[PDB]
Amino acid sequence: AHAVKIYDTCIGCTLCVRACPTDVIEMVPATVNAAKQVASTPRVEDCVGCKRCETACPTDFLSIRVYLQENEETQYSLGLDLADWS
Amino acid sequence: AVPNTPKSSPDTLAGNRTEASAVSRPYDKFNVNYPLSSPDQARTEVTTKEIPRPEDLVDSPKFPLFGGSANGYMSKATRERHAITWTAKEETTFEMPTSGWAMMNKGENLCYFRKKEQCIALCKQLRSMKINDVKIYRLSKDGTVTFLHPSDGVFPEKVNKGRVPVNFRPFTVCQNAKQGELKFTEYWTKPYEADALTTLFVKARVAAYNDVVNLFPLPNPKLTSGPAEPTSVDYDALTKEAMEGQKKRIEAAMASV
Amino acid sequence: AYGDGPKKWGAVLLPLTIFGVGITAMGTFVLYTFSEDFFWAFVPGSKRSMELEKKKKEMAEKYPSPVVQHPADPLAGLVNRADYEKGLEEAWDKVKPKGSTVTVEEKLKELSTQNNPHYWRNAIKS
Amino acid sequence: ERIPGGKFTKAQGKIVATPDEDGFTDSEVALALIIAAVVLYLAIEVTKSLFYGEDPETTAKGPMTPFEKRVVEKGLFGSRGDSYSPFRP
Amino acid sequence: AWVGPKKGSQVRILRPESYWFQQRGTVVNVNQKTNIKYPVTVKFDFVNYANVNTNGFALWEVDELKEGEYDPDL
Amino acid sequence: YTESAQDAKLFETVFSTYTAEYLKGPMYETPEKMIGRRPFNPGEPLWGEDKKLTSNVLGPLKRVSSNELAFLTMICLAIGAWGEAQFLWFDPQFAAIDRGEYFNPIYIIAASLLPVSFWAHIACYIQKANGK
Amino acid sequence: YGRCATQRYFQVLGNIHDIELNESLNSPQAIQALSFGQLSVILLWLAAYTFHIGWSGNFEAFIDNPLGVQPINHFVLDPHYSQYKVDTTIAALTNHPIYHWLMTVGFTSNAQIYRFTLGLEITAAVMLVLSLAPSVGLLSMGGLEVVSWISICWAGHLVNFAPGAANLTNVVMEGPGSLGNLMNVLTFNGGIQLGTQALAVSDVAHHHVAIGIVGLWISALLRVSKYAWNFNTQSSYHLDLSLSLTVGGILTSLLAQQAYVYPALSYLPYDYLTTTSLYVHHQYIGAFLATGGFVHGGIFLVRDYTLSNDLVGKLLATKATVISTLSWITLFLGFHATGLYMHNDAMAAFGVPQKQIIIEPVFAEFIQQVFFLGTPVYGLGSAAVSSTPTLSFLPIISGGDFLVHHAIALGLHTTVLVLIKGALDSQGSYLFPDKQSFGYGFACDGPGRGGTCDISTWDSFYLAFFWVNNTVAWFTYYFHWKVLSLWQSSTAVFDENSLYLMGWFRDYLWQNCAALLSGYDSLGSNDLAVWAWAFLLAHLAWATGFMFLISWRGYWQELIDTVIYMHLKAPFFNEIWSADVVTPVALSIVQARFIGLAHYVAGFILTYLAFVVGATS
Numbered sequence A: 001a002h003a004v005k006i007y008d009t010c011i012g013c014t015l016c017v018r019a020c021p022t023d024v025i026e027m028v029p030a031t032v033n034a035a036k037q038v039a040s041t042p043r044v045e046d047c048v049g050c051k052r053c054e055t056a057c058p059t060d061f062l063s064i065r066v067y068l069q070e071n072e073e074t075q076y077s078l079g080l081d082l083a084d085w086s
Numbered sequence B: 001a002v003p004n005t006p007k008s009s010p011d012t013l014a015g016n017r018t019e020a021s022a023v024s025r026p027y028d029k030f031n032v033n034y035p036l037s038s039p040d041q042a043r044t045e046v047t048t049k050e051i052p053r054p055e056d057l058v059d060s061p062k063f064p065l066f067g068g069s070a071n072g073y074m075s076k077a078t079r080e081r082h083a084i085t086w087t088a089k090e091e092t093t094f095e096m097p098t099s100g101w102a103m104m105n106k107g108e109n110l111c112y113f114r115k116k117e118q119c120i121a122l123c124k125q126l127r128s129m130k131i132n133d134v135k136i137y138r139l140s141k142d143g144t145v146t147f148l149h150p151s152d153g154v155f156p157e158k159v160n161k162g163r164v165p166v167n168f169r170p171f172t173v174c175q176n177a178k179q180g181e182l183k184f185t186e187y188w189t190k191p192y193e194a195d196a197l198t199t200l201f202v203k204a205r206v207a208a209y210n211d212v213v214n215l216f217p218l219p220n221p222k223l224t225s226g227p228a229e230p231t232s233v234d235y236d237a238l239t240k241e242a243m244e245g246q247k248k249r250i251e252a253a254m255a256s257v
Numbered sequence C: 001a002y003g004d005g006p007k008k009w010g011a012v013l014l015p016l017t018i019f020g021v022g023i024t025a026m027g028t029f030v031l032y033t034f035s036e037d038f039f040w041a042f043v044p045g046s047k048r049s050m051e052l053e054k055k056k057k058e059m060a061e062k063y064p065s066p067v068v069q070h071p072a073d074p075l076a077g078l079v080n081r082a083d084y085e086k087g088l089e090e091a092w093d094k095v096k097p098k099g100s101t102v103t104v105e106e107k108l109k110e111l112s113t114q115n116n117p118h119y120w121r122n123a124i125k126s
Numbered sequence D: 001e002r003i004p005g006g007k008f009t010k011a012q013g014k015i016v017a018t019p020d021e022d023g024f025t026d027s028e029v030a031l032a033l034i035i036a037a038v039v040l041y042l043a044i045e046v047t048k049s050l051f052y053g054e055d056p057e058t059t060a061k062g063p064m065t066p067f068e069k070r071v072v073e074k075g076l077f078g079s080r081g082d083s084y085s086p087f088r089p
Numbered sequence E: 001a002w003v004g005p006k007k008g009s010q011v012r013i014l015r016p017e018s019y020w021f022q023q024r025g026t027v028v029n030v031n032q033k034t035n036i037k038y039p040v041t042v043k044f045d046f047v048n049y050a051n052v053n054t055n056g057f058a059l060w061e062v063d064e065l066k067e068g069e070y071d072p073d074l
Numbered sequence F: 001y002t003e004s005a006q007d008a009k010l011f012e013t014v015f016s017t018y019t020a021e022y023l024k025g026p027m028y029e030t031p032e033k034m035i036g037r038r039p040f041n042p043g044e045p046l047w048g049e050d051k052k053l054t055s056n057v058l059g060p061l062k063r064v065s066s067n068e069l070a071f072l073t074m075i076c077l078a079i080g081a082w083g084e085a086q087f088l089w090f091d092p093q094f095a096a097i098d099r100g101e102y103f104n105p106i107y108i109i110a111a112s113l114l115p116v117s118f119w120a121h122i123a124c125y126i127q128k129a130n131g132k
Numbered sequence G: 001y002g003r004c005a006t007q008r009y010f011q012v013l014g015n016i017h018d019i020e021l022n023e024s025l026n027s028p029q030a031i032q033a034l035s036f037g038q039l040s041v042i043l044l045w046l047a048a049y050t051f052h053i054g055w056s057g058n059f060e061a062f063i064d065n066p067l068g069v070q071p072i073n074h075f076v077l078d079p080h081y082s083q084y085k086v087d088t089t090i091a092a093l094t095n096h097p098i099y100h101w102l103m104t105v106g107f108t109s110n111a112q113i114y115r116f117t118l119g120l121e122i123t124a125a126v127m128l129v130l131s132l133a134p135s136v137g138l139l140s141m142g143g144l145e146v147v148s149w150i151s152i153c154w155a156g157h158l159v160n161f162a163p164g165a166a167n168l169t170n171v172v173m174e175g176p177g178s179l180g181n182l183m184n185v186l187t188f189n190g191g192i193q194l195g196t197q198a199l200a201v202s203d204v205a206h207h208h209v210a211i212g213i214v215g216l217w218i219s220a221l222l223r224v225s226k227y228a229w230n231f232n233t234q235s236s237y238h239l240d241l242s243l244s245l246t247v248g249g250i251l252t253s254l255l256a257q258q259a260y261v262y263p264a265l266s267y268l269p270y271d272y273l274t275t276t277s278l279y280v281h282h283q284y285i286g287a288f289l290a291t292g293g294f295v296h297g298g299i300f301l302v303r304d305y306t307l308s309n310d311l312v313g314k315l316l317a318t319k320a321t322v323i324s325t326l327s328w329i330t331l332f333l334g335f336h337a338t339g340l341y342m343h344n345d346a347m348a349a350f351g352v353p354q355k356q357i358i359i360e361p362v363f364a365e366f367i368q369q370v371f372f373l374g375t376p377v378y379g380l381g382s383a384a385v386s387s388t389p390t391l392s393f394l395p396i397i398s399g400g401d402f403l404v405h406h407a408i409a410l411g412l413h414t415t416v417l418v419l420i421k422g423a424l425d426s427q428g429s430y431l432f433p434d435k436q437s438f439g440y441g442f443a444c445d446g447p448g449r450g451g452t453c454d455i456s457t458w459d460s461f462y463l464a465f466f467w468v469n470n471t472v473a474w475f476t477y478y479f480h481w482k483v484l485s486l487w488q489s490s491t492a493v494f495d496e497n498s499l500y501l502m503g504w505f506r507d508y509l510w511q512n513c514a515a516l517l518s519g520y521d522s523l524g525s526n527d528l529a530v531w532a533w534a535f536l537l538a539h540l541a542w543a544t545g546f547m548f549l550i551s552w553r554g555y556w557q558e559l560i561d562t563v564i565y566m567h568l569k570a571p572f573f574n575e576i577w578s579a580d581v582v583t584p585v586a587l588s589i590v591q592a593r594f595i596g597l598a599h600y601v602a603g604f605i606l607t608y609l610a611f612v613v614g615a616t617s
């Protein structure tokens, strides 16, 4: 499961949420940005690692970071379509 | 048909897919609240009666106008299914996530897919066509149904109450500890998983190491079975003067800030 | 003759050494793939690795080492963590912004706590 | 008999002189194979030792030798460090 | 009272990882709320690799520069 | 009291500064701080706040006076120069080998003392700068 | 079990020896045990060579006529041979100087070789025994004192087996005696001794005793320098590994150079193929070791270094200057070397070879004449002729060697540029500011920020290994053509046609492939058939590396998905294979890049080895 993290620099764009093809990122209330909302990743197990969320983050560097973990691949992380491991 | 599909059941072909995933991939596990972020988040429960497994549905009225394709999921070769339940306002054409085209029903609609990515792509397409209440479910091997996507009822693009932040790190991305600083710890290869306290502590520790004018010698252990070496340096006096130096240095540093 | 020697030994061994040995190696590697200890040291959370970690912890807590070791928890190195925090508290009170309501122990709890359920050692219900 | 290939083999006229006999007979080859079998047994032992790693009790339950005690105490031979460095000094 | 750099004033970025580190940018607006961690919104002539030239910075990550104490030639 | 983000950053700075100034002393006890790893050896600080080498950097001859080290390095330099000159150019020893006779051990032993003189004069200046 | 993917293989096999990640045997005792096992493998490999040389080989016939006999490596018993090929082939000939080494170190019989094989097997058993019991006690073994003692013992062996040892009067029993008595076994004549056309065994023994004694003294001096100023501030297995690898690469490259120019094995220069293979092999090994030193330096930066105001911190702070200046050096060298070569190509093509830009290597000629040569060959710097010159195999340089050395400098500087750039950007670039938290090797950072392909620090080595192979190819072409011209007595075809690159094609590659390609044809097959076959095999491996490097994953993952669909829809097999066991997935990006590089370099090495054999046969 590719770990995905959210940092203080997030400004509540919701672009990372809209860019996720597997509904990993999620908008929680917070008191750190003017938008009063901050991205969170409660469904990292569905993260394929495509880094579309990083392509849509407007901050100077990625307020959302996807750390690929090749030693912990999952059928959800590998995007398996014809093989089931459950 | 035996040449079209294998004659054995999906469970028979699966063998011990479970009890081997727990061995082959012991890391692959879901957290205690998979679709949600906090334990006290309603956690709406659905059963097979609401969203049945696809092998139990034949010519269901809720299926869209789909002609079948080779790009669907692997029946009898995979057991995990993802289902979409969305309600239409009119009967129009849409692209299946597995290529090909289907036509939505006037009312309720229901599709089955293998990967959640296909379901999310279809949800994006439908919401682009002004469709609400797109609910995405997951079908397990034994038939347990997990409700996903608008897990708390509100789409993730819109902030909603009761959603605890997850994987939120209270600093900038480059304020993570370096791997060398987190060496010999559980976070050596994964500094992004360290606590804020741990990262700050190691970032202060590296600075402490680079001040050998005040760093403490940390005397050698007494491992040999013989008598203690008389030496020529008093560790007690050094410890006392190091306590004094630490006190004065902390006082000066706090005066600076 | 010159040919004899390596001819007979070769006719015995080269079939063995190539066919039998390589085929046995391939088959045993396929078996090792389906073995429970398949790359156990490099698969996170594997049963053998977790049992080894538990036994290492048990040996460390049963046979203390006179020499100082690298702390698995960086804060566990402190000989008196109580004194560490007490000093912090004193320094923070010295440089607290006015009558701030924020205390040191609450801040340490806030920094130490972290919600990363998807990180392993947390997905193993640990 | 060989068909020579390459300009230098023909030019220099080097001949591959086959020895009249073999060179190792058969008994000494058998002795070499026996010694290699012993080496193979030792290699199997080493492979079993390394694959399962070092058990946690050894180096923790077995007390260090006085040489090892004094070396760790005084920081010698790569101790007081985290490196191997066979060419230490 | 106003806290942070003045609107429209050139500031030098002190954030080590920022694409415009030690470079210069114009302050668009500073959020006058104590809870905002990165209120100082700075606009730069150069766009980063994401083709975005506006970012918010913390109060301690920007150095306000006087009208003639910086280098006009970058 | 509606803690500010700047107040949180101030606490982070205070924590980092306090930790940094606290882990230096004998209250952290990490393998790095063990003698012969990062620290300066117990009773022998090599340099102080100013980066000036102390007499402890010389080791066994940490209390040999500056005058004695100057004499040692000058004598070693003179003897080594004499040995090198008598080995290479004046009465060359390789040419003596070509004559079938052995080397002259005096020349080799003398010429061995030039790096001795080098490190000896470096140590001599270290002692002189420390007032020894 | 085994409900993983095929990606598990290439994911773990890429780190299967990354023992720092292997928590079980993570202690340094285990790493020393790995060293013991590796040395046991080396001993068994040397035992292999000695056993097959003494079993089916002509060493007893080699010592008698080292110039007129071709050394035999092992007996060939391939069942695929046709009776003619069986009658054609005698045995696998020798491409290594083990016959020469055994002759030099005093082997005079196959019985001695057999005892050597037994001793090698017993020593491998000893190494395995030592590896059985890792222990801080065994960590004491080693050190520069130990290797210097090994050198002293080797000096003793060479003294015992020097050709003049028979005339030696026993020093330890009858005293040192006259100087000539010691000269029977210890000499410093210098250079080739004529006859054997190699350094005297007395010279080598004397060298080794001197080196061992000096090494003991140097180790003692280094340890007293550790007495005062005792600072092991940065200990890392990768830092020490980088030190060892860089020193070993320097030593191996120096070995290649000084073993060609000062051969130490008797009757080695008479064997052209073994000399060329020796030089090429050792230069490749040295370049690989230097590249490994840089790689492990990068790894130490990635996951073992803590930023400080030290040497490495200073290097990192001004890494932009280092990378920019290295880029300037590489750009200048490449621009000028390529431009001069193209100018010479145009001049030679246009029938005007005089108008080529031939910059005389006057600096290297000055060094050679003033410091090395004993006769006036060029006359610059000095013209004195030595009354009693010594012999060696130092080549005489000319105009083309200037351009070739500039190509070598370009290759070395570009390799260093890539390696240093990757290692120093492992700490982060403005495209990837947080590379310190991503590990040494990773695929990419995605298509965002314009693209981040090959941004990993491991990808820096992946890119620089092509340059390593290219630089080694350049200077090994240089060495091979130089020695081919010297042996074929041309020495003017090289000096004129190496100025332009069409010469490097026509006279070197196209010319020296004539006999190799005729290894087998319609007429028949000769002893070079195996090398033509290996030539083709190496080209095939190189182009498969091209496949793995050019085409990337996604395509192949979709294709493999369709193949899985075919299998799951196939009759008689969907009942048996559900793709759940070892799921076939495409190679990961890092795995694909490494496998493509591996095929590329395997084809590289095998192609050049086959070409060298077919050219210098």
Ligand code: CLA
Residues within 6 Å of the ligand: C006, C008, C009, C010, C011, C013, C014, C015, C017, C018, D029, D032, D033, D036, G040, G041, G042, G044, G045, G047, G048, G049, G051, G074, G075, G076, G077
């Ligand atoms: C690097 C080691 C090595 C290699 C590659 C070879 C290669 C070869 N040997 Mg051989 N051999 C070796 C060492 C080696 N030998 C040693 C040390 C001995 C002394 C016991 C022998 C004794 C020997 C005999 C008696 C015969 C061969 C034969 C052969 C040929 C056919 C293969 C075979 O049947 O092997 C059989 C070899 C053995 C049974 C001996 C075991 C080999 C050593 C001890 C193991 C070395 C392993 C090494 C450390 C690498 C391990 C890692 C690996 C997994 C990658 C082939 C050319 C045959 C031949 O010429 O027929 C045409 C034959 O009849 N060998």
Ligand code: CLA
Residues within 6 Å of the ligand: G013, G014, G015, G016, G017, G018, G019, G241, G245, G288, G289, G290, G291, G292, G293, G295, G299, G440, G441, G458, G461, G537, G538, G541, G598, G602, G603, G606
């Ligand atoms: C004594 C020297 C030495 C030592 C101890 C190490 C040790 C290590 N290296 Mg290292 N390295 C070295 C030299 C050394 N290296 C050199 C010289 C280079 C430059 C070439 C490198 C380049 C290098 C890289 C780039 C990396 C390492 C890594 C590592 C670590 C993991 C090794 C691993 O699992 O690889 C796995 C080993 C393999 C997969 C071996 C490949 C098998 C080969 C290719 C087979 C092909 C040959 C085939 C038979 C030919 C067929 C021919 C055909 C015609 C048939 C480990 C600590 C890794 C690391 O630390 O990352 C965190 C890493 O990424 N090393």
Ligand code: CLA
Residues within 6 Å of the ligand: G327, G328, G330, G331, G332, G333, G334, G335, G336, G338, G339, G410, G414, G417, G418, G463, G464, G466, G467
């Ligand atoms: C023939 C193939 C080839 C060529 C020419 C180059 C050329 C270059 N590579 Mg390169 N590379 C190659 C294959 C090649 N690579 C392969 C296969 C790989 C493996 C992936 C790499 C991996 C690689 C890396 C990883 C790096 C390079 C770098 C470089 C540059 C080094 C600086 C230099 O020499 O400038 C000289 C430039 C040339 C020779 C290009 C040709 C220019 C003209 C045509 C020749 C001169 C004509 C004349 C003088 C100009 C006329 C001027 C006026 C009259 C108009 C250079 C542009 C390094 C770099 O960019 O640093 C600056 C670097 O980091 N390369």
Ligand code: CLA
Residues within 6 Å of the ligand: G329, G332, G333, G359, G360, G361, G362, G363, G364, G365, G397, G401, G402, G403, G405, G406, G408, G409
């Ligand atoms: C970065 C530039 C660079 C590099 C890396 C090298 C590298 C090398 N050169 Mg070289 N060379 C260069 C530029 C360079 N050259 C230039 C510009 C010229 C003038 C045409 C030469 C002329 C030259 C000759 C004649 C010889 C070498 C040789 C060599 C090799 C041996 C080392 C040596 O002699 O150092 C030489 C290094 C220098 C002289 C330093 C040059 C570095 C400067 C900074 C580059 C710019 C110089 C500038 C244009 C001069 C302006 C002059 C003007 C003010 C009057 C080595 C591969 C030798 C060789 O081929 O061995 C076989 C040899 O004999 N070089």
Ligand SMILES: CC1=C(/C=C/C(C)=C/C=C/C(C)=C/C=C/C=C(C)/C=C/C=C(C)/C=C/C2=C(C)CCCC2(C)C)C(C)(C)CCC1
Residues within 6 Å of the ligand: C017, C018, C019, C021, C022, C023
């Ligand atoms: C020598 C030696 C060694 C090695 C070993 C090895 C390395 C082995 C391997 C082995 C192997 C690796 C084997 C393999 C095999 C394979 C096979 C045997 C296959 C076959 C196949 C076939 C026969 C068929 C083919 C085909 C097809 C399929 C199609 C196309 C056509 C054809 C027909 C061709 C060592 C060092 C260890 C030690 C001892 C000695």
Ligand SMILES: CC1=C(/C=C/C(C)=C/C=C/C(C)=C/C=C/C=C(C)/C=C/C=C(C)/C=C/C2=C(C)CCCC2(C)C)C(C)(C)CCC1
Residues within 6 Å of the ligand: G242, G246, G290, G293, G294, G296, G297, G298, G300, G301, G312, G315, G367, G419, G420, G423, G424
């Ligand atoms: C990445 C990195 C790293 C690594 C590094 C390295 C890897 C290095 C190497 C280095 C090296 C590898 C070096 C080398 C050197 C060498 C030398 C220094 C030599 C010299 C010599 C000379 C100079 C001489 C010359 C000559 C001759 C001999 C002849 C001719 C003439 C003349 C005189 C010229 C580290 C981590 C650590 C740090 C950080 C970064």
Ligand SMILES: CC1=C(C/C=C(\C)CCC[C@H](C)CCC[C@H](C)CCCC(C)C)C(=O)c2ccccc2C1=O
Residues within 6 Å of the ligand: C029, C030, G009, G547, G548, G551, G552, G553, G554, G556, G557, G560, G585, G586, G587, G588, G589, G592
């Ligand atoms: C061809 C190709 C493939 C397909 C190649 C694969 C899947 C590997 C080929 C496997 C070979 C054919 C061996 C197959 C299995 C053998 C039976 C050996 C099994 C060994 C195990 C038991 C260890 C990729 O996956 C790929 C990925 C990324 C970039 C480029 C490419 C690429 O070019």
Ligand code: SF4
Residues within 6 Å of the ligand: A009, A010, A011, A012, A013, A014, A015, A016, A017, A038, A039, A056, A057, A058, A059, A063, A064
């Ligand atoms: S796109 Fe980036 S800044 Fe915007 S909400 Fe998502 S993570 Fe935060």
Ligand code: SF4
Residues within 6 Å of the ligand: A004, A019, A020, A021, A022, A023, A024, A025, A046, A047, A048, A049, A050, A051, A052, A053, A054, A066
């Ligand atoms: S990498 Fe892709 S799947 Fe993973 S969180 Fe980002 S957008 Fe979602």
